[PDB]
């Protein structure tokens, strides 16, 4: 058991004898203000800080922590910026802990840059009692392990301000944060249920999945690969129309267009929640400009700047930077590129006769997310030697300008492949007349019979759920806090939910289900961070924050990239404006009775390109006299033939005014739902107002 | 002469002992704190009022009016919320009036609601002597009308300290938006008239205008009327295209996107402005809410609804305000139809021989014009009647919409001319084989030879020219100033500004003059106002304000919609795109020779629609065999003649390809510029830092 103290640093027992009057330094400076008590152990020795009531309140002055009154509108205690009242304990371990780390931040030699230096081994808070204790008398951490951080308690609500009141402000703000994005996930994961329904429900009545469906017409398509596969028809490959009539029928338009409102509901919703937050908890915004300590490079560099006298460096950084981002992009293209070309040779020496082309889509979707699972680390460290190479002045700017680094290296490296099979996938590739060869090798890339759309939803699906399945498959409380791991920070849970957040704004065009899965993940990750925080971590020093930071900045941005996003998918891979320019313009029947027929384009089979037809064109049963592509080109028994035809000028046209119409008139209702959704509650404003004309009232009397 | 008063109101001499007891209960109310003295004259009766230096302080002090200390830091006067002077003359005459109009404005029966009841005429406060005097002893509207008022001063910058502190920070901060734009529109009138005259340098020398201006062709087009008139060549009207090469060049282009630019810069430019503008004159923001009292409609509902005792009626008024914007497009739609409708028979009963169509079309743009400044009264009287009837709780919040719904029907009925002939002027009329006929009677209109992107240009041009033209074509001082104008508001002289930064930001991409115009009118209107301001109204009563208010929401929202309306202007009215498409696509020389002939779509002459051939097919000397109408359109020799060909869709793909990357890459471009330029500048944040610092340090000791 320990006595009470509030902070606790962890010495490194036996340069040498200059760390060890480098260690001493520190304390014989810190008994002005706080006591000491240096442990004991067998291998390396500990240390101890118990804060004095006289330093107490002044520390507590000093900075204007706004603690409780003990007069009360209407059954809420009234809080002022220091106030009086007996029985010493009203002073939390939480405040206790954050005064002592403010005097360890302030007292030089702050603490930090010595325990950078390595002097100290560690420097953390202690946890309030054991969790499963036995006989624990009404434990903090214990009462948030039983009502919070188990698993059989996921359904019901968490306590935020108990969570506040132990981790502090910016640990309760994530939860907070994530608790309103699983609470904002309800509607959503409804809605999008609902769609996914209807797809069920008109799969079997739509008419150009029983195009494709029906037999007896026997449609011969063209081979779509150089010289290994040959000619199949367009009733086989029917199955992949049939399920993605599931994921583009015309209701997933308005799923696109209501999940653009609930991502503008939820930002409002949560800008809303975080101000009644920060009305709950610190209502003064006294966190002033200059007062943090600058870095210790940063005075490094200012010390040999004026010894030997900058305005270039500062700028090579961002286009170093720069560079690095289109390197990301073009390596998770490649990457992507050589994952669906790893899995290949699979009927020769296992023969497992898969005949569904899912399992090596499976297949290279996850050894793609195993690269990127590795390259991710690798992006992170350079991000951090590029901001460590630019030493920027405070930590405030040095921890955006990692963050914004970080998740602009995570955005590219976890978007590039799913940007890459949703528009630049099959387009580059010409008619079977001439294919587009890259390197002269080989063919760029077709990709699969029945569209595209199924390998990017299954490949949307592997990514939310192998997300989840990657997890799925006596002594003193100073050493006990010793022996576990050090708390690293919010900055990766952030950022995971931040890429949760853009796959599902930005591809819900495509994948209508996307908000279940978000939502039966962040269920699993609330409770799992709750557990990890409580259990596995040291209590983290529980400093104040207002807001999330810069993590609502890239929110905003990634809730604007998802309306053009959306508005390209659903116009160029979602074979819907397609659909609209038949049924409009060429239709004789008011129906798309046809639609199959209008899309595929005849080609004479004895005008390829030296040798490239199959070696076996009989495949088939029988040999074919003109195969079926799909490029909207003219026919062979035309006099331009294979070259474009109206049609696909048309249909382009309708594809380009439906991005046009989508963009303005979704980003122009985002717009108003954040404008009509007021910033400052009602509620809130009202009970500012009352508590500060109650606290003139108590100051004038 | 005056004495030293500073407040007055006017009585009306003569229900009416009812009136005299309304008057008499208020200056009985008023001696509590400020003096009185009723003047005499012939007729009607006035009063004044002067304050008290037992008074002065005490409402200076109830409101943080910040005033000058004695401590400077860097010759810099610092200011705190009151401040201790003798020679009580400190408080300017500005100052003391504010404090007596606060006085009159609490003190109930405040003195607006008996002024609207009418039991006093005016209540108007005194300016300082009299400009152009005999030998007055430096008065500041004098100076003001010395240095900021004359004609001859225009290029000097204005003093917008002294007319702050002579008219209030509502007219200084006016001013000072006016100087900064007028400022602003410096480089934006460089480039301009570089881009115009990079025009005139290349008309000569482009080939699409040779090709028109090029006789020895004789190129017979159709004659754009049903029965009147007839055929004509290309190579008549070919002054059109050749001026209007002028206003399409790739240099219009760089145009728009450098004016979406400037009106971003120009955005963060005033924002820093009145950031320092607010720096320099009242750092306090203590301007508080629930503050304002309420409207007396405001309290007579509460009160009625109380006794008798709403939620749909304050959403029925904006449905009646949208149904009148809606109808307000409708009538400014058939009123620029009806007007350049009215402008005809000119060569019959005149017989004037213009022979230029631009003489009809300066007509048909100055009457409607004159129908448009008529219709402008009636939608301002309008949107005061339909705020009255929604009864807003605060004057904020009333003056608020009634500015928002008089913007809206000025913009709609402003820009709706010029968006019908930019965008739905000659689009919906069909090819010469069946016109589209509106009401049975008349085809819908073809607009002028050689594209009416020139009508457009004329029109701006006379409007942009025509706000101009219009106007280029012993006593006691309270009476003196009874005798003047009524100080309206800032709210016209507002309007009329965002009206032409509307018309600059909006039309830029086609008329690459615009800011010429708009500067060339700033500067006569600067000093205009000044001299409005400073002889023919009475002195405003001089209210604090921080910033613009919703004026700054309607210029950002005007530059964003200028993005989109560039690029829909460029598109489909420039005539720009089926260039680079010609250019790019139906080439085969590399350069555009044939571009006219590309452009020209045939029609066999035998083929019209109930003898609308033109009655006299001879007019230019031989009978025409195929007339080329302008309509992308198949030629008459062909198995599908006269539909819509594969240039058509290949033209209409590539102009919303264009709309969708200039909007897109303009935005993000715009937001990058209003992220880049901070928001704080470095001087004003280090200057409160220190006279921050400084006032604790003085407050400390």
């Given at each position: 058991?320990?006595?009470?103290?509030?902070?606790?640093?962890?010495?490194?027992?036996?340069?040498?004898?200059?760390?060890?009057?480098?260690?001493?330094?520190?304390?014989?400076?810190?008994?002005?203000?706080?006591?000491?008590?240096?442990?004991?152990?067998?291998?390396?020795?500990?240390?101890?800080?118990?804060?004095?009531?006289?330093?107490?309140?002044?520390?507590?002055?000093?900075?204007?922590?706004?603690?409780?009154?003990?007069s009360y509108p209407f059954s809420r205690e009234k809080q002022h910026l220091f106030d009086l009242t007996d029985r010493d304990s009203f002073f939390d371990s939480k405040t206790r802990?954050?005064?002592?780390?403010?005097?360890?931040?302030?007292?030089?030699?702050?603490?930090?840059?010595?325990?950078?230096?390595?002097?100290?081994?560690?420097?953390?808070?202690?946890?309030?009692?054991?969790?499963?204790?036995?006989?624990?008398?009404?434990?903090?951490?214990?009462?948030?392990?039983?009502?919070?951080?188990?698993?059989?308690?996921?359904?019901?609500?968490?306590?935020?301000?108990?969570?506040?009141?132990?981790?502090?402000?910016?640990?309760?703000?994530?939860?907070?944060?994530?608790?309103?994005?699983?609470?904002?996930?309800?509607?959503?994961?409804?809605?999008?249920?609902?769609?996914?329904?209807?797809?069920?429900?008109?799969?079997?009545?739509?008419?150009?999945?029983?195009?494709?469906?029906?037999?007896?017409?026997?449609?011969?398509?063209?081979?779509?690969?150089?010289?290994?596969?040959?000619?199949?028809?367009?009733?086989?490959?029917?199955?992949?129309?049939?399920?993605?009539?599931?994921?583009?029928?015309?209701?997933?338009?308005?799923?696109?267009?209501?999940?653009?409102?609930?991502?503008?509901?939820?930002?409002?919703?949560?800008?809303?929640?975080?101000?009644?937050?920060?009305?709950?908890?610190?209502?003064?915004?006294?966190?002033?400009?200059?007062?943090?300590?600058?870095?210790?490079?940063?005075?490094?560099?200012?010390?040999?700047?004026?010894?030997?006298?900058?305005?270039?460096?500062?700028?090579?950084?961002?286009?170093?930077?720069?560079?690095?981002?289109?390197?990301?992009?073009?390596?998770?293209?490649?990457?992507?590129?050589?994952?669906?070309?790893?899995?290949?040779?699979?009927?020769?020496?296992?023969?497992?006769?898969?005949?569904?082309?899912?399992?090596?889509?499976?297949?290279?979707?996850?050894?793609?997310?195993?690269?990127?699972?590795?390259?991710?680390?690798?992006?992170?460290?350079?991000?951090?030697?590029?901001?460590?190479?630019?030493?920027?002045?405070?930590?405030?700017?040095?921890?955006?300008?990692?963050?914004?680094?970080?998740?602009?290296?995570?955005?590219?490296?976890?978007?590039?492949?799913?940007?890459?099979?949703?528009?630049?996938?099959?387009?580059?590739?010409?008619?079977?007349?001439?294919?587009?060869?890259?390197?002269?090798?080989?063919?760029?890339?077709?990709?699969?019979?029945?569209?595209?759309?199924?390998?990017?939803?299954?490949?949307?699906?592997?990514?939310?759920?192998?997300?989840?399945?990657?997890?799925?498959?006596?002594?003193?409380?100073?050493?006990?806090?010793?022996?576990?791991?050090?708390?690293?920070?919010?900055?990766?849970?952030?950022?995971?939910?931040?890429?949760?957040?853009?796959?599902?704004?930005?591809?819900?065009?495509?994948?209508?289900?996307?908000?279940?899965?978000?939502?039966?993940?962040?269920?699993?990750?609330?409770?799992?961070?709750?557990?990890?925080?409580?259990?596995?971590?040291?209590?983290?020093?529980?400093?104040?924050?207002?807001?999330?930071?810069?993590?609502?900045?890239?929110?905003?941005?990634?809730?604007?990239?998802?309306?053009?996003?959306?508005?390209?998918?659903?116009?160029?891979?979602?074979?819907?404006?397609?659909?609209?320019?038949?049924?409009?313009?060429?239709?004789?029947?008011?129906?798309?009775?046809?639609?199959?027929?209008?899309?595929?384009?005849?080609?004479?089979?004895?005008?390829?390109?030296?040798?490239?037809?199959?070696?076996?064109?009989?495949?088939?049963?029988?040999?074919?006299?003109?195969?079926?592509?799909?490029?909207?080109?003219?026919?062979?028994?035309?006099?331009?033939?294979?070259?474009?035809?109206?049609?696909?000028?048309?249909?382009?046209?309708?594809?380009?005014?439906?991005?046009?119409?989508?963009?303005?008139?979704?980003?122009?209702?985002?717009?108003?739902?954040?404008?009509?959704?007021?910033?400052?509650?009602?509620?809130?404003?009202?009970?500012?107002?009352?508590?500060?004309?109650?606290?003139?009232?108590?100051?004038?009397?």
């Open positions: 058991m320990d006595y009470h103290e509030d902070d606790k640093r962890f010495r490194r027992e036996e340069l040498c004898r200059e760390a060890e009057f480098l260690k001493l330094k520190m304390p014989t400076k810190k008994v002005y203000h706080i006591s000491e008590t240096r442990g004991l152990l067998k291998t390396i020795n500990s240390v101890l800080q118990k804060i004095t009531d006289p330093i107490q309140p002044k520390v507590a002055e000093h900075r204007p922590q706004t603690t409780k009154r003990l802990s954050t005064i002592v780390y403010e005097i360890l931040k302030r007292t030089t030699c702050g603490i930090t840059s010595l325990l950078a230096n390595g002097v100290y081994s560690a420097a953390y808070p202690l946890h309030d009692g054991d969790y499963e204790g036995d006989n624990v008398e009404f434990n903090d951490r214990k009462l948030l392990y039983e009502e919070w951080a188990s698993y059989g308690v996921f359904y019901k609500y968490q306590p935020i301000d108990l969570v506040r009141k132990y981790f502090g402000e910016k640990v309760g703000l994530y939860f907070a944060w994530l608790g309103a994005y699983t609470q904002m996930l309800i509607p959503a994961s409804i809605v999008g249920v609902i769609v996914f329904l209807y797809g069920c429900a008109t799969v079997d009545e739509n008419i150009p999945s029983m195009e494709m469906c029906d037999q007896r017409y026997n449609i011969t398509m063209c081979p779509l690969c150089d010289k290994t596969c040959s000619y199949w028809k367009m009733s086989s490959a029917c199955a992949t129309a049939r399920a993605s009539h599931l994921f583009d029928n015309p209701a997933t338009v308005f799923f696109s267009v209501f999940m653009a409102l609930w991502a503008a509901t939820f930002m409002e919703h949560w800008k809303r929640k975080q101000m009644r937050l920060n009305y709950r908890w610190d209502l003064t915004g006294f966190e002033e400009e200059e007062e943090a300590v600058k870095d210790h490079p940063r005075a490094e560099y200012e010390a040999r700047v004026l010894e030997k006298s900058p305005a270039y460096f500062t700028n090579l950084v961002s286009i170093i930077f720069m560079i690095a981002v289109t390197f990301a992009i073009v390596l998770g293209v490649i990457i992507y590129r050589i994952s669906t070309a790893a899995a290949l040779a699979m009927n020769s020496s296992p023969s497992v006769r898969s005949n569904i082309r899912v399992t090596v889509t499976a297949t290279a979707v996850i050894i793609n997310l195993v690269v990127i699972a590795l390259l991710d680390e690798v992006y992170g460290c350079i991000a951090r030697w590029l901001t460590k190479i630019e030493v920027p002045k405070t930590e405030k700017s040095f921890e955006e300008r990692l963050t914004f680094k970080a998740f602009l290296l995570k955005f590219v490296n976890s978007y590039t492949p799913i940007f890459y099979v949703a528009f630049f996938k099959g387009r580059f590739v010409g008619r079977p007349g001439d294919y587009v060869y890259i390197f002269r090798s080989f063919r760029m890339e077709e990709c699969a019979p029945g569209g595209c759309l199924m390998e990017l939803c299954i490949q949307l699906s592997i990514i939310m759920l192998g997300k989840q399945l990657i997890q799925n498959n006596r002594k003193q409380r100073y050493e006990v806090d010793f022996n576990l791991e050090p708390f690293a920070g919010l900055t990766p849970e952030y950022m995971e939910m931040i890429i949760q957040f853009g796959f599902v704004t930005l591809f819900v065009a495509s994948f209508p289900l996307a908000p279940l899965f978000a939502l039966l993940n962040n269920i699993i990750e609330i409770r799992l961070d709750a557990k990890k925080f409580v259990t596995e971590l040291r209590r983290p020093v529980a400093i104040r924050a207002k807001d999330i930071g810069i993590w609502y900045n890239i929110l905003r941005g990634v809730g604007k990239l998802a309306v053009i996003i959306n508005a390209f998918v659903i116009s160029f891979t979602s074979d819907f404006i397609p659909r609209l320019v038949y049924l409009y313009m060429y239709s004789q029947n008011g129906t798309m009775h046809g639609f199959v027929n209008h899309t595929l384009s005849s080609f004479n089979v004895s005008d390829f390109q030296n040798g490239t037809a199959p070696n076996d064109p009989l495949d088939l049963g029988y040999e074919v006299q003109i195969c079926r592509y799909k490029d909207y080109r003219e026919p062979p028994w035309s006099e331009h033939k294979y070259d474009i035809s109206k049609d696909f000028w048309a249909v382009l046209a309708a594809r380009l005014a439906f991005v046009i119409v989508f963009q303005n008139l979704v980003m122009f209702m985002s717009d108003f739902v954040d404008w009509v959704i007021p910033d400052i509650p009602k509620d809130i404003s009202q009970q500012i107002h009352k508590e500060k004309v109650l606290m003139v009232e108590l100051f004038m009397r």
